[PDB]
Amino acid sequence: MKGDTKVINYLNKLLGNELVAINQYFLHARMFKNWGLKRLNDVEYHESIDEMKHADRYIERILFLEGLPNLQDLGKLNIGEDVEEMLRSDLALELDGAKNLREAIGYADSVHDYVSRDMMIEILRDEEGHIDWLETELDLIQKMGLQNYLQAQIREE
Amino acid sequence: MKGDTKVINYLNKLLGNELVAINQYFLHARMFKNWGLKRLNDVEYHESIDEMKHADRYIERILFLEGLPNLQDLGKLNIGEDVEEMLRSDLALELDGAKNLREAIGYADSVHDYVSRDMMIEILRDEEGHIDWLETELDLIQKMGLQNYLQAQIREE
Amino acid sequence: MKGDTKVINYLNKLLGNELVAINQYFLHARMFKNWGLKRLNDVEYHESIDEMKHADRYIERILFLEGLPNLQDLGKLNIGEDVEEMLRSDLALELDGAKNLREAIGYADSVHDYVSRDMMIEILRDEEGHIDWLETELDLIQKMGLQNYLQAQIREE
Amino acid sequence: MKGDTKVINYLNKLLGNELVAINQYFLHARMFKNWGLKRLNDVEYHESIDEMKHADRYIERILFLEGLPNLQDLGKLNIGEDVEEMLRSDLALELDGAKNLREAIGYADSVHDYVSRDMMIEILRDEEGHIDWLETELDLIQKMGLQNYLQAQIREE
Amino acid sequence: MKGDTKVINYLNKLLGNELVAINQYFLHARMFKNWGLKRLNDVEYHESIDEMKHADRYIERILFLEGLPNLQDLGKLNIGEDVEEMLRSDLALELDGAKNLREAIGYADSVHDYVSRDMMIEILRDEEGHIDWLETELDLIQKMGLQNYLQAQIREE
Amino acid sequence: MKGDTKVINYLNKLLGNELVAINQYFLHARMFKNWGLKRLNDVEYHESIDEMKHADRYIERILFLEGLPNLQDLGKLNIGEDVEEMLRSDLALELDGAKNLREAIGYADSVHDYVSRDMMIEILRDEEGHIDWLETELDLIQKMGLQNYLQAQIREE
Amino acid sequence: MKGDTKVINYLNKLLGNELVAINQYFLHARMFKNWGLKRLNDVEYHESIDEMKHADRYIERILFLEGLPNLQDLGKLNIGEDVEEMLRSDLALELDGAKNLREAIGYADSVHDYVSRDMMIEILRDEEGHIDWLETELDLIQKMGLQNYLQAQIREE
Ligand code: HEM
Ligand code: HEM
Ligand code: HEM
Ligand code: HEM
Ligand SMILES: [Zn+2]
Ligand SMILES: [Zn+2]
Ligand SMILES: [Zn+2]
Ligand SMILES: [Zn+2]
Ligand SMILES: [Zn+2]
Ligand SMILES: [Zn+2]
Ligand SMILES: [Zn+2]
Ligand SMILES: [Zn+2]
Ligand SMILES: [Zn+2]
Ligand SMILES: [Zn+2]
Ligand SMILES: [Zn+2]
Ligand SMILES: [Zn+2]
Ligand SMILES: [Zn+2]
Ligand SMILES: [Zn+2]
C-alpha cells in the first residue's frame, strides 16, 4: 500500500535511532556482565532486545508502505568507560530519540497515517519507560554513593 | 439502629483521620516507587490499603447507626520532600490519630456502644503496628546511615 | 523527565475529579448496601475502585513528569438521599469529568505529550462505560417504575 | 450440478428473507443490550446467528446448483422504537418468510429437487421455533404487564 | 471457678432472652417455609441456629462459674400473623435483648469478669447483625411494596 | 450520551462499508469453497467474520451516542467471476473503505470524540491487514503464475 | 586476562562481518515475509538470530581479552531486489566471512590462543551450515524453476 514518502523517511530515521541504541545497550550490557554487575547486564540486555523489537516493527511497516528500510547508515555510538558515563550516554540517546518520535508522530497525524502513528505511540511509551529507568538509576547513584550502588548490582534481581 | 450522636461525631472524626492517612501514604508510596525505592513503595502502599479498609469500617458503622459519613472535609496533608521527613510526617499523623482513637474508645464504653468500641480497638491494634513500623525504620536510618538504608530499599522483600 | 507545566496542571485537575468520584461512589455503594440493594452496592463499589485505579495512574504520571500531585484540595461532593438522586449526581459528575478529560486530551496532543494523551484516552473509554451504566439505570427506573427497579437490586448479579 | 432455474430463484428469494432478518434481529439485539435488557439481547443475538447460518446454507446450495447468489437486493427493514413494536415486526417478518418457505418446498418437490426440499424443511422447523418464541414473549407482555416484563429481562438467563 | 452471683443472674437472664428468640425465629422460619417464602425461611432458620449457639455459650459459661443454668422459665413469645408483623416482633425482641446485653456487659466489667464480658460483646456484635437484617427487610417492604417484596422471597438466595 | 451528529453520520457511512464487505467476502469465500480452493475459503471466511465484528462495534457505538444505525442502504457489490478479479474487487473496496476511515478519524478528533476515534484506529489497523493480505496474494499470482497459485489453494493451512 | 593484540583485531574484524550479516539477513527475512514467502522468512530470520549469537560471543570474548569491541563501523550491505539476487548476495557475504574466519583460526593457533580458536571453529561450523542451505536453495531454483520454487515457499515448514 503506497505510503507517504516523508512518513517513510521519518520511519527510516527512527529505525536508524533504534539501530544505534541496540548496539550501544548490547555493548554496555556485556561490559557490565564482564565487570560482574549482573543486575545491570540483565536490564541493559533486556533494553537492547526491546530496541531490536522496535527495529523489527519499523522494518515491517516501511516494507508494507513500499519503502526501502535503510540498515546501512549507523549513527554515532558513545560508549563511555565507567557506569555513570555509560548510563548518561544511554539517557542522552533516548531523549534525542524521543524528540524525533514526537516530531514523526505529529507529522503522521497531519497526513492521516494513523496506523503508523499508533505504532509510534506504543514505541514512545516503551521509550519513556527506558528513560524513567535510566533517570532513576542515575539518581540512586547520587543518593547512595557509587560504592553502595555497585554493590547492589552484583546479584541478579 | 439509632446510635449516640457524640459516638457518630467521634466516628466521623476518626474517618477524617483515615482519609488524610490514605492520601498521604498513597502519595508517599508512589514517590518512593518513582525514586526506585521498591521496598518502601510496597510497605506504604499496603499501609494505604489498610487505612482504606479502616475508612470502609467507619463508613459502614456510621450508616448502621443512622448518621451521615462525612467524606467532604479533608484535613491537612504534610507530604515532605525526602525519606526521613516523609516517614516522620506519617509517624506524627499516626500518633495524633491514636490519641483521637483512645479518646473515642473510652467514650464509646461510657455510653455502652461496645460494638463500635470493639471495632475501634481492632483498628487501634492495626495503627500501633503502623507506628511500630515507622519508628523502627526511622531508628534504622540512624543506625546504618542514610546511604546504606537507601540501598536496602531498592529490592522488594 | 520534565513535563509541560500546563499538562501537569491538567493532570492535577483530572486527579482532583477522580478523588471526588472515589468518595462519592464509595459512600453511595455503602448507602446502597445499608439499604439492602446488593446489586447497586456491587456496581458502585467497582466504579469507586476504577476511579481509585485512575487516580493512581495520574499520580504516577505527574511524578514521572516531575510535578507535585495535589491530593489536598477535595472538590464538592453531592451525596443525595434517594436512589434516583444519587445516580443523577454520579452522572452529572461523570459528564463534567469527561468534559475536562476531552479538553486535556486535545491539549496534550498540541504539546506532543502523546503518552499522557494515550493514558487519558484509556481513562476516557472507562468513563464512557460508567456514563453508559448510569444512563441505562436511570432509564430503567423510568421504564419499569421505582418499585420494580428496587426489587431487582436486592440480589447480587 | 445444474439446478432448476425456478428453484434457484426461490432459493435467492429465501436468502433475501434471511438477509433482512439477520440485520433486523442484530439491530434489535443491540438496541436491547443498550437499554439494559440483557435476556432479550441474548435471545435476539442468537436468532440473528441462526439466520446467518440459514443464509450460508442457501448460498452454498445455490452455488452447488450453478446459480448466482444475490446478496445485493436488501428488502425493507422495519425497526420499531419500543419492545412490543420490535417483537411484532420480527413476528410479521417471520410469518412472511414462512409463507415463502412453504411455497418453495411445494415447488422443489414437484421438480424432484428433494435435497433442496429437505434443507428447506429443516430451515422451516427452525423458523417455527423463532415464531413460537416471539408469539410467547408478546403474550407474556400482555399477561404480566410491560413493567414486570421489562424487569424480567435485566439479567442473562 | 466460683463466679460472681449477679454475673450468673445476668447470664441466666440473657440465656432466657436467647431461649425465647430460638423458638420465635424457628417458628417464624417454618411459617415462611409453609407459605413458600423460601428466602425468609433460610434467613430466619439461620438466625434461630445463631441463637442456639448463643444459648450454648451461656450454658457452658454459667456451668464453669458454678451456677445453675435455668432453661425452665420461658418468656413471652409474640408470633404474629403476617410477614411485617412477624419481622417487627423479632426486631422488638432483639432490641430488648440488646439493652439487657449492654447492662450485663457494664456490670461484668465492674466486677472484673472480663472473659464473661468478652463473650457477651461477641454475642452483642452478632445481635446487631440480626437487628440490621430486620431493619433493612422492614424498610424494603415499605420501598418496593409488599407484593414485590413477597415475590422476591420465593427462591432461595 | 448524546453524540455529535456528524460523528454518527460517519459511523453510519463506515457501517455501510462493512455491510458491503461482509456480503462480498462471504460470497467470495463460498465461491472458493465450491471451486475446491479451501485455503482461500478459509481466509475470506475469516475476513467476513472480521467485518461482521467491525459492523457490531459501529452499531453499538452509534446506539451509545443516541443515533440510529442504518442497516438498510446496502451499497454496490462487485462480485467478479475468477480468482484475480474477485481479489482485485475486494482490494478496491478495502482501499475506498480505508479512505473513509481516515476522514472520519480526523473529524472525530476535531470534535473531541476520542473514544470513537480510538475505536476507528483499531479498525483501520485491521483493514490495513486485509489490504496487505490482498496485495500479497495478487503479487503471488503474478510471481508463480495462476496454475501454481491455484494448486497452492487446495489444502487448508 | 590480557589478550594478543592481533587476535583482538581479528575478533573485531569477524564481529564486523557478523554485524553486516545480522542486518542483511534480517531485512531479507522481512522482505520475504512481505512477499508472503513464509518459509524463506523463517529460515532467514533464524540465520539472523544465529549471527546475533555469534556477534555476542565475539563481544564477550574481546572484552574478556581486555580489548574494545567495535560496533561502530558497519561494512557494505548488498540487499538485492529479487529472491535469487538476495540469496546470491547472502552466499557471497558468507564465503567472504568464512575466508576471514579461516585466517583468524590459523593465527589464534600460532599465538596459543586456543580458546579463541575453539570458539571460532564452532562458529565456522555454523557458517558452513548457512553456506550449505544457501547453495542448496540456489540449486533448487535452477532445477525446479522459479515458479515452482516460489510456490514451495508460501507455507511454513
Ligand atoms: C537489525 C538489528 C537487529 C535486529 C532487527 C534484531 C532483532 C532481534 C529480534 C526480533 C530478536 C528476537 C527477540 C525476541 O522476541 O525475544 C532478537 C534477539 C536477539 N538478539 Fe537481535 N537484533 C539486531 C541486532 C542484534 C545485535 C547487534 C546483537 C548483538 C549482540 C543482537 C543480539 C541478540 C541476541 C543475543 C538475541 C537473543 C537470541 C536468543 O538467544 O534467542 N541482536 N533480535
Ligand atoms: C474514600 C477513600 C477510599 C476508600 C474508602 C478506599 C477503599 C478501598 C478498598 C476497600 C479497597 C479494597 C481493598 C482490599 O480489600 O484489598 C481499595 C483498593 C484500592 N485503592 Fe482505595 N479507597 C479510597 C481511596 C483511594 C485513593 C485516594 C486511592 C488513590 C490512589 C486509592 C487506591 C486504591 C488502589 C490502587 C486499590 C487496589 C485496587 C486493585 O485491586 O487494583 N484508594 N480501596
Ligand atoms: C424449638 C426448638 C429448637 C429447635 C426447633 C431446634 C432445632 C434445631 C435444628 C433443626 C438443628 C440442626 C440439626 C441438624 O440437622 O443437624 C439444630 C441444631 C443445633 N441446636 Fe437446636 N433447636 C431447638 C432448641 C435448641 C436449644 C435450647 C439449644 C440450646 C443449646 C439448641 C442448640 C443447638 C446446637 C448447638 C445445634 C448445632 C448448631 C451448629 O453448630 O450448627 N437448640 N437445632
Ligand atoms: C449485520 C450484519 C452481520 C452482522 C452484524 C454479523 C455479526 C456476526 C457476529 C458478531 C458473529 C459472531 C462472530 C464471533 O465472535 O465469532 C457472526 C458470526 C457468523 N456470521 Fe454474521 N453478521 C452479519 C452478517 C452475516 C451474513 C450475511 C452472513 C451470511 C452468511 C453471516 C454469517 C455468519 C456465520 C456463518 C457466523 C458463524 C456462525 C457460527 O457457526 O457460530 N453473517 N456474525
Ligand atoms: Zn526503541
Ligand atoms: Zn529505548
Ligand atoms: Zn487506620
Ligand atoms: Zn495507620
Ligand atoms: Zn475515573
Ligand atoms: Zn468514572
Ligand atoms: Zn432463517
Ligand atoms: Zn427466523
Ligand atoms: Zn443471640
Ligand atoms: Zn439475635
Ligand atoms: Zn472492517
Ligand atoms: Zn476489511
Ligand atoms: Zn555468524
Ligand atoms: Zn552465517
Swiss-Prot record, chains A, B, C, D, E, F, G:
Q: Name one GO biological process term.
A: iron ion transport
Q: Which cofactor does it need?
A: heme b; Fe cation
Q: Where, in this chain's numbering, is Fe cation 3 bound?
A: 46, 50
Q: Which UniProt keywords apply?
A: Heme, Iron, Iron storage, Metal-binding, Oxidoreductase
Query: What effect is documented for mutating residue 86 to L?
Result: No loss of heme binding
Question: Does the record bear Nucleotide-binding in its keywords?
Answer: no
Result of changing residue 127 to Q: Decreased Fe(2+) oxidation activity. Is also affected in its ability to lay down an iron core
Q: What is the effect of changing residue 38 to M?
A: In strain: ECOR 30
Any one Gene Ontology molecular-function term assigned to this protein's record: ferroxidase activity
* Ferritin-like diiron domain sequence ranges: 1-145
Which residues are recorded as binding Fe cation 1? 18, 51, 54, 127
Binding residue positions for heme b: 52
Provide the function of this protein. Iron-storage protein, whose ferroxidase center binds Fe(2+), oxidizes it using dioxygen to Fe(3+), and participates in the subsequent Fe(3+) oxide mineral core formation within the central cavity of the BFR protein shell. The mineralized iron core can contain as many as 2700 iron atoms/24-meric molecule.
The miscellaneous remark of the record is: The internal surface iron site that binds iron 3 is important for the mineralization phase but not for Fe(2+) binding and oxidation at the ferroxidase center.
Q: What is this protein called?
A: Bacterioferritin
